[PDB]
Write a protein that binds this ligand. Structure first.
Ligand code: CLA
Ligand code: CLA
Ligand code: CLA
Ligand code: CLA
Ligand code: CLA
Ligand code: CLA
Ligand code: CLA
Ligand code: LHG
Ligand code: 5X6
Ligand code: 5X6
Ligand code: A1L64
Ligand code: SF4
Lengths: 739, 52, 178, 178, 42, 161
């Protein structure tokens, strides 16, 4: 049922000049600079503003439209820069020998040096977002199509902004509407995902397939018919894919094999572009569309048929788990934080899956041999995933403090987890120590043995071997699967598992990735860093409400600095403080993942092939022997590969040199916040305030040092920005020079 | 006053270094701010350094 | 409630129709941002300078002082030809005038501190032309209207000279289009 | 008000169209005035009306006559846009449109505060509607002519893009499509 | 102009950004028209 | 004195820097077609570079053995433009900002909106103060001698000692 209240909130600027109107605590106005920071920190903490779940839900729904508007403006900007300020068309004509660029700088204070020589007569910043490859796969062949997409984006942005306003101020849904989770799932599965995938199949078959087939055969872009020509003149299509002569009769009569020319199961890669076959991508999306449209008929809405989510959950209980999933349905229909926690965990995990899948099965034409794009996309999507996972921990902890009740959770799975939190955390503590010693300890062994002139005592491929035999065995299964356990597939899902060296131009797109001792060792580092990040976040959640040290922790809240210097000292016991610490470990963990990727690809995958067939890798296979000591990482990775960024001054890569130094600065500045405390700073401010009072220039809003918690927040935010931007600059300067 | 002198030195010393980095990075070392240490050179001359 | 000169806008609160030159013209409501007394003083002063400057531009095309330094019949070019030391003497003398005329009260905070101080009124009427109250009231409006006109004229004169590098009259006699 | 829309007998009269304004025959099927203020929409309607009417007449007169100088020189109206962007003539028109629109910013804000009626600038130099009844009559004509001109201009520009003929060139020949 | 809107335009961050942007523009425009002033020319 | 320095117009290293910079730009220029936007951009950089080097040559700024301008900041008037004149300009501007800001702060303290007017500026009041900054040196000097600049030590809070 549609349930709404009309004309709820007037539209005027009255409250815009009343900062902190939304909070009882903040509405009174500042006495102190602390108020200014609190205003920003509390702006989107909607459940701290009101107790009404209906009011909270309405703000959220409307804020979501706001986010979508922002995303459409950003998307529109990308298309517009493509149309107006790029070498897209030139690249379209000669994609092997032109670098993509869609940002051009104005000539002020000498910055026009940044307009690099990217080819096609063009000068601009070389982009690594993969937009050109995306647009090629979509069948876009001219700037007019980009312009029109940009305009459509501005229209969508305005429509989202209207809907946000409308659904808050004019027609706000009632709580009962939001709690229709069965209806929401049916629509998001069948409607959003199902019809989305079906719609995209439609584009693929009717636009992408023909245009890309003509491009790959070597037809000049300007000589290719416009998309609508393929729709109106079926003969144009049937020339390329003969099954179009038979029309839609095979579909309705279940003679689907007739369409096996444009719906394929090839595997491998297009040899011309080094990307997945678009006929496979078309079939993928059709299959996905069918499964999703069926999936979205599972739940009961307005008719007798379907499942109750509550009934499913309530049935799943066994002899080890008490009341089982009883009470979870109530949690997940009354707590936005509980929903956010799950959804961040999955969205983050998915981003990480996307990183891996896109490098190994490159879905776009000319992606694989655009090394800057491959490196950028993997790295970007790994970071987004990491941040989302830490967010899941934050919102799981906020739920435990604010939304958990004992009465709702009597002897269910949630209750039973917290009743053995000591067993969980103690074991995770142990597994982290075990992993730490038997992963990082092996590198230290190796450093020591090599320094002592005992290479024969090292863990290495040529001494004491640690072969990843299980991974090696899986690689073999995947390489022999085509025509066996996958009989109707022609080639491997990925050449990373084994098989041919695919090359485009004379650049290697993808080839088998051998796994040896160096690969075994770095995989156990990843296991280690992920387990520790989990430890910190899990501990935050399970001890959010109380511990042996602080029995009433929940009353202190989610975000508080400590409970004083007693009981030995209680700094950083809060759930928030576990997120703080978890961010550093996520940073540590993902830094090593992207370093592993960068080095392994350059050493063992990327490079040139001769006509004879002699592979020349970017770092010449040094990974196996260098990546088994810390000295090898310091010297052969950091020191060696930093040569590009560090020698960039006076060239078009000079921006990266500047960002590299700037990012080192922001990182170091973070340490001022992390290592100090506000007692020092508040005292310093007292002397400075004395000088202002003396000269009759002291503010009425009294200066305060940052709160204890804000000090920590500022510290970790500068640590991450500095740390991540350093690697960004390092990576881009390097890969743009050699790739 | 110690706070003032520290801020004064900090803002301007870091500032000049960053001016110099940006202008050298964009390929114009001739735009650098380069102050001769003439007071120290004068003290060297007072002890008999002829160079200056 | 409406402006007289812009009839679709509410009258600016500080324009009461009393001051000379007031037809309620302030569509950007500048008289709400800035002090009206200071604005009025500034308007008259800009006007008086531009009245002199307009006459200056013309007379300098024909009449000159002795010497090749005080030649040049284009006024904007004459600025860079004449002795720089002379321009400093004018500047510093204007500075002294500004200080004395305003009795050392030279900012919006203090210029109208005395209640008797009125915008533009320095008590300068040697010949006693404004002895008659009624005539003086007319002259107050004429001063402002002529000042306003001279401001726009001098704006022209300058931009015309930048475009042509000819005198005011030279351009009219030898009118060359764009 | 008449309950059922006059223009659409199968639809209710829009809730926020009260019947009193000129042009109102209950035509708002998409329900814009449910969410947006009618005063804002009418302000916009009349601005489009008045710009279009000037445009319609401009297209007509430009094809029948131009000013007798080579700077002008007959071209098709649609092409003239790019001609006079280059000369700077189009920037001149933009200069004074900006000026009037920045002023209008204050007019529109005061309208939304209820101090001004949509479309009113009190502009009637010749005094053609001193009587209320003639004014209301002319309100309807302004809307009707303005609404017509809005579409008409759409015709002119599109038909040119297709036919590559002027308004009167096309009426002289009138060749059908393929 | 609407008083509530004008009050919003008077808030510290809005005036902060506008004023810094104008100042920044002035410096940019000086350097665009008179570039490379290492010293006062005299 | 400054025997370790030389005028930049007499410097062979300074001239070689011009030559080498231009030579690089002309190589970059040869990659593009005459008349193209890229070509014109590089030409503008060449002109701007030439203008800069010639400006410094005609100025009488001294050059080191590196062939780069070195500035003298000891007070001698033959190098006034290198530091003293910029310094006076900075002090005049910075003193203005400080003085008008101090004036605004004091004005709002004499109201009921002492705190509100810090986060929501009274813009008319602010512009009045900002407009009055041009004689801040004299204002500040008179305020000092009047005894209105400073509070007494006994009227400002201090901690225990
Ligand atoms: C997230 C979105 C996003 C981002 C980061 C950018 C960033 C940029 N834009 Mg783009 N732009 C965008 C969306 C975006 N744009 C959209 C949606 C449109 C369609 C309206 C445009 C249309 C556009 C044009 C026409 C131009 C830019 C330009 C620029 C550059 C300079 C802007 C500037 O200095 O402002 C200055 C600020 C003012 C207030 C003026 C900068 C790289 C400029 C450029 O690339 O120059 C070569 C430029 O001319 N943008
Ligand atoms: C168009 C005019 C308009 C007006 C006059 C109002 C007026 C109001 N809104 Mg509404 N609203 C609107 C449009 C409007 N809204 C739109 C388009 C949406 C969809 C997002 C909403 C959704 C909405 C919600 C969910 C809520 C309101 C609320 C309110 C009230 C308080 C607003 C306030 O004080 O914050 C002023 C805040 C701003 C000016 C900042 C907004 C920032 C925008 C959204 C994003 C900026 C882009 C990006 C982040 C910039 C980054 C820069 C970069 C450097 C990082 C006020 C009555 C609140 C209320 O309490 O009512 C009872 C409330 O909870 N509105
Ligand atoms: C690179 C690392 C770093 C930097 C830059 C600073 C900087 C500073 N420290 Mg800190 N400190 C550090 C590490 C650092 N510290 C560490 C590791 C510790 C151990 C915990 C401390 C402990 C410490 C103590 C105990 C004290 C200081 C003090 C200071 C100030 C000294 C005076 C000065 O230089 O003013 C000049 C200011 C700077 C150099 C700061 C940066 C200015 C930036 C670059 C301006 C950028 C503006 C620009 C428009 C960009 C805006 C960004 C945008 C997002 C808005 C200065 C703010 C002292 C102080 O406060 O004296 C008054 C003081 O007592 N520090
Ligand atoms: C009150 C005393 C006074 C004295 C001693 C001088 C003396 C001088 N004036 Mg100055 N002058 C004065 C008041 C005075 N002036 C005032 C009040 C004004 C503004 C009304 C000027 C406006 C003025 C200009 C425009 C010029 C002079 C110039 C001169 C110098 C050359 C004139 C000559 O001898 O032939 C001479 C040093 C000339 C000069 O500086 O030569 C380079 C010059 O060009 N004067
Ligand atoms: C209010 C002052 C004003 C001024 C000084 C200008 C000045 C100009 N206009 Mg602009 N213009 C204005 C208002 C103004 N315009 C207005 C209100 C509009 C309506 C939007 C326009 C629309 C417009 C267009 C479409 C074009 C211009 C062009 C020009 C330029 C023509 C150059 C030329 O060769 O002149 C030659 C002049 C003559 C042969 C003498 C003509 C004499 C007339 C009467 C003008 C004198 C008017 C005077 C300033 C005030 C009253 C005089 C008095 C006798 C009553 C010139 C820079 C043109 C351009 O850009 O050229 C490149 C152009 O195409 N203007
Ligand atoms: C160490 C502190 C110091 C200070 C405060 C000043 C201050 C000043 N000097 Mg400098 N000066 C200094 C060291 C200093 N000087 C040294 C070591 C030298 C020799 C290298 C000079 C060489 C110098 C010259 C040649 C001149 C000054 C001048 C000046 C004045 C401008 C100003 C009073 C100028 C002046 O006119 O002095 C009155 C001036 O012509 N100074
Ligand atoms: C009108 C504002 C004003 C004035 C006159 C002063 C004056 C002073 N400050 Mg203070 N200060 C200010 C604002 C101001 N400050 C603000 C906003 C901050 C927070 C960043 C500080 C933080 C600060 C520190 C940490 C220290 C001083 C110190 C000093 C003294 C030495 C000079 C200095 O080091 O400045 C340095 C100050 C800065 C670099 C901060 C930036 C100043 C901003 C740009 C001014 C803001 C202007 C304001 C927004 C204008 C609005 C006016 C308008 C509404 C009319 C001097 C008494 C020092 C001292 O005690 O020496 C004895 C000292 O150590 N100030
Ligand atoms: C995942 C495999 C876990 C198998 C545990 C076995 C398993 O699945 O048991 C599941 C078992 C099932 O209990 P029930 O029959 O009551 O479950 C009914 C459900 O409907 C309610 O949960 O639960 C328990 O016995 C408690 C879990 C103890 C867990 C102890 C070990 C935890 C550490 C695991 C270390 C291995 C990690 C390897 C990851 C690759
Ligand atoms: C070099 C030398 C020569 C000597 C040069 C010598 C004798 C000539 C000196 C000329 C002087 C006396 C002219 C005086 C210049 C008068 C000025 C231009 C007045 C400024 C008025 C302002 C603009 C008032 C504005 C304002 C008013 C309107 C209103 C107030 O409220 C505000 C202020 C802002 C004050 C020669 C001739 C021998 C030739 C030889 O070959 C070389
Ligand atoms: C209601 C009504 C019905 C009418 C309904 C019907 C569908 C109405 C739809 C009319 C629309 C489509 C008009 C569209 C108007 C199009 C606009 C006006 C185009 C602007 C072009 C610009 C202005 C060019 C700029 C140019 C470009 C882009 C680029 C530059 O280089 C050159 C210039 C030159 C500047 C009926 C029929 C049933 C009858 C009944 O009685 C009631
Ligand atoms: C334990 O860690 C720390 C603290 O406590 C937890 C601190 O407190 C501080 C000190 C830092 C403070 C007080 C924040 C600095 C904030 C700024 C720069 C002031 C903001 C001022 C304005 C917006 C006005 C300026 C106006 C314009 C430029 C327009 C530091 C360094 C710290 O390590
Ligand atoms: S040191 Fe800080 S965080 Fe730790 S107990 Fe004391 S006040 Fe709390």
């Amino acid at each position: 049922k549609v349930l709404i209240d009309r004309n709820v909130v007037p539209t005027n600027f009255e409250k815009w000049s009343k900062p902190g109107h939304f909070s009882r605590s903040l509405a009174k106005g500042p006495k102190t600079t602390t108020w200014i920071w609190n205003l920003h920190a509390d702006a989107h903490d909607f459940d701290s503003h009101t107790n009404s779940l209906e009011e909270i839900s309405r703000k959220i729904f409307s804020a979501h439209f706001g986010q979508l508007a922002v995303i459409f403006i950003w998307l529109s900007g990308m298309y517009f820069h493509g149309a107006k300020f790029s070498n897209y068309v030139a690249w379209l004509n000669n994609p092997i020998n032109i670098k993509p660029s869609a940002q051009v700088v104005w000539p002020i204070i000498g910055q026009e040096i940044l307009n690099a020589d990217v080819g096609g007569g063009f000068q601009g910043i070389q982009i690594t977002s993969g937009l050109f490859q995306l647009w090629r796969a979509s069948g876009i062949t001219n700037e007019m199509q980009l312009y029109v997409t940009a305009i459509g984006g501005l229209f969508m942005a305005s429509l989202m902004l209207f809907a946000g306003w409308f659904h808050y101020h004019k027609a706000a849904p009632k709580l009962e509407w939001f709690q229709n989770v069965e209806s929401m799932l049916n629509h998001h599965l069948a409607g959003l995902l199902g019809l989305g995938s079906l719609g995209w199949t439609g584009h693929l078959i009717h636009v992408s397939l023909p245009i890309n087939k003509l491009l790959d055969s070597g037809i000049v872009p300007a000589q290719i018919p416009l998309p609508h020509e393929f729709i109106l003149n079926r003969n144009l299509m049937s020339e390329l894919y003969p099954s179009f002569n038979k029309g839609l009769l095979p579909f309705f009569t279940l003679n689907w094999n007739e369409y096996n020319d444009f719906l394929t199961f090839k595997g491998g890669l297009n040899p011309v572009t080094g990307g997945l076959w678009l006929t496979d991508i078309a079939h993928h999306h059709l299959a996905i569309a069918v499964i999703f449209i069926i999936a979205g008929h599972m739940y009961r809405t307005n008719w007798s048929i379907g499942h109750s989510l509550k009934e499913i959950l309530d049935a799943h209980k066994g002899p080890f788990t008490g009341e089982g999933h009883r009470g979870l349905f109530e949690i997940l229909t009354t707590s936005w934080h509980a929903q956010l926690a799950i959804n961040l965990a999955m969205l983050g995990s998915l981003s990480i899956i996307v990183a891996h899948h896109m490098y190994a099965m490159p879905p776009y034409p000319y992606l694989a041999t655009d090394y800057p794009t491959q490196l950028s996309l993997f790295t970007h999507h790994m970071w987004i995933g990491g941040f989302c996972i830490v967010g899941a921990g934050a919102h799981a902890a906020i739920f435990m403090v604010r939304d958990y009740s004992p009465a709702q959770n009597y002897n269910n799975l949630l209750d039973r987890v917290i009743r053995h939190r000591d067993a969980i955390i103690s074991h995770l503590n142990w597994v982290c120590i075990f992993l730490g010693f038997h992963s990082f300890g092996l590198y230290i062994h190796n450093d020591t043995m090599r320094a002592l002139g005992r290479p024969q005592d090292m863990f290495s491929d040529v001494a004491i071997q640690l072969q990843p035999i299980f991974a090696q065995w899986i690689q073999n299964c995947h390489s022999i699967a085509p025509g066996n356990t996958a009989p109707n597939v022609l080639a491997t899902t990925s050449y990373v598992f084994g098989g041919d060296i695919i090359s485009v131009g004379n650049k290697i797109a993808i080839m088998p990735m051998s796994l040896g001792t160096a690969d075994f060792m770095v995989h156990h580092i990843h296991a280690f860093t992920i387990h520790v990040t989990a430890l910190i976040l899990l501990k935050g959640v399970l001890f959010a409400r109380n511990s042996r040290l602080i029995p009433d922790k929940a009353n202190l809240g989610f975000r508080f600095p400590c409970d004083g210097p007693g009981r030995g000292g209680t700094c950083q016991v809060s759930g928030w403080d576990h997120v703080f610490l978890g961010l550093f470990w996520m940073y540590n963990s993902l830094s090593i993942v992207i370093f592993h990727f960068s080095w392994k690809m350059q050493s063992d995958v990327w490079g040139t092939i001769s006509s004879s067939g002699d592979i020349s890798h970017i770092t010449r296979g040094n990974f196996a022997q260098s990546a088994i000591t810390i000295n090898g990482w310091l010297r052969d990775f950091l020191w060696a590969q930093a040569s590009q960024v560090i020698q960039s001054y006076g060239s078009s890569s000079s921006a990266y040199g500047l960002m590299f130094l700037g990012a080192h600065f922001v990182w170091a500045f973070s340490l001022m916040f992390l290592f100090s405390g506000r007692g020092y700073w508040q005292e310093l401010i007292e002397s400075i305030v004395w000088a202002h009072n003396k000269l009759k220039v002291a503010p009425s809003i009294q200066p305060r040092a940052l709160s204890i918690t804000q000090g920590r927040a500022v510290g970790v935010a500068h640590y991450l920005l500095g740390g991540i931007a350093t690697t960004w600059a390092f990576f881009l300067a390097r890969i743009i020079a050699i790739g | 006053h110690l706070s003032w002198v520290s801020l004064f030195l900090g803002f301007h010393t870091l500032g000049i270094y960053v001016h110099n980095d940006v202008v050298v990075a964009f390929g114009s070392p001739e735009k650098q701010i380069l102050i001769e240490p003439v007071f120290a050179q004068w003290i060297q001359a007072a002890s008999g350094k002829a160079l200056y | 409630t409406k402006s007289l000169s812009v009839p679709f806008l509410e009258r600016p609160k500080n324009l009461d129709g009393t001051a000379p030159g007031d037809v309620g013209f302030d569509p950007l409501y500048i008289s709400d941002l800035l002090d009206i007394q200071w604005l009025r003083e500034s308007e008259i002063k800009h006007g008086r300078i531009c009245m002199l400057a307009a006459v200056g531009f013309i007379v300098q095309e024909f009449v000159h002082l002795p010497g090749e330094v005080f030649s040049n019949k284009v006024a904007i070019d004459a600025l860079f030809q004449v002795p720089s030391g002379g321009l400093w003497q004018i500047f510093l003398f204007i500075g002294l005038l500004e200080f004395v005329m305003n009795k050392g009260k030279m900012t919006p905070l203090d210029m109208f501190s005395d209640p008797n101080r009125k915008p533009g009124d320095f008590g300068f009427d040697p010949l006693g032309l404004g002895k008659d109250p009624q005539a003086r009231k007319r002259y107050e409006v004429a001063e402002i209207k002529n000042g306003r006109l001279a401001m726009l004229a001098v704006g022209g004169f300058i931009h015309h000279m930048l475009l042509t590098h000819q005198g005011v009259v030279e351009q009219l006699t030898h009118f060359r289009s764009l | 008000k008449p309950k059922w829309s006059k223009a659409l007998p199968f639809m209710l009269w829009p809730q926020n169209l009260d019947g009193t304004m000129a042009g109102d025959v209950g035509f708002d099927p998409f329900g814009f005035t449910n969410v947006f203020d009618v005063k804002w929409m009418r302000e916009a309607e009349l601005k489009h009306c008045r710009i279009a009417m000037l445009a319609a007449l401009g297209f007509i007169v430009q094809e029948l006559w131009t000013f007798p100088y080579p700077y002008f020189s007959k071209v098709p109206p649609v092409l003239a846009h790019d001609v006079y962007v280059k000369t700077g003539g189009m920037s001149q028109i933009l200069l004074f449109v900006i000026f009037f629109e920045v002023i209008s910013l204050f007019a529109v804000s005061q309208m939304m505060e209820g101090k001004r009626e949509p479309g009113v600038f009190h502009f009637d130099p010749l005094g053609l509607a001193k009587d209320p009844d003639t004014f209301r009559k002319y309100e309807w004509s302004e809307l009707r002519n303005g609404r017509l001109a809005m579409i008409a201009v759409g015709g002119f520009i599109h038909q040119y893009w297709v036919t590559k003929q002027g308004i009167f060139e096309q009426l002289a020949n009138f060749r059908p499509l393929s | 102009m609407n008083k509530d809107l004008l009050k919003y335009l008077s808030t510290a961050p809005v005036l902060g950004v506008i004023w810094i942007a104008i100042t920044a523009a002035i410096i940019v425009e000086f350097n665009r028209l008179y570039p490379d002033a290492l010293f006062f020319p005299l | 004195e400054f025997n370790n320095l030389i005028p930049c117009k007499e410097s062979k290293i300074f001239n070689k820097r011009l030559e080498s910079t231009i030579k690089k730009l002309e190589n970059k220029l040869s990659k593009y077609e005459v008349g193209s936007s890229s070509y014109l951009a590089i030409k503008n950089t060449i002109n701007k570079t030439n203008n800069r080097f010639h400006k410094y040559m005609e100025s009488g700024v001294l050059c080191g053995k590196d062939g780069l301008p070195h500035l003298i900041a000891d007070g001698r008037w033959s190098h006034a433009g290198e530091f003293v004149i910029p310094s006076l300009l900075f002090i005049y501007i910075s003193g203005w900002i400080g003085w008008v800001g101090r004036g605004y702060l004091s004005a709002i303290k004499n109201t009921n909106k002492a705190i509100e007017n810090e986060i929501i500026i009274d813009v008319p009041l602010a512009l009045k103060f900002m407009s009055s900054g041009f004689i801040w040196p004299l204002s500040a000097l008179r305020e000092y001698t009047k005894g209105d600049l400073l509070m007494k030590d006994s009227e400002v809070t201090i901690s225990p000692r």
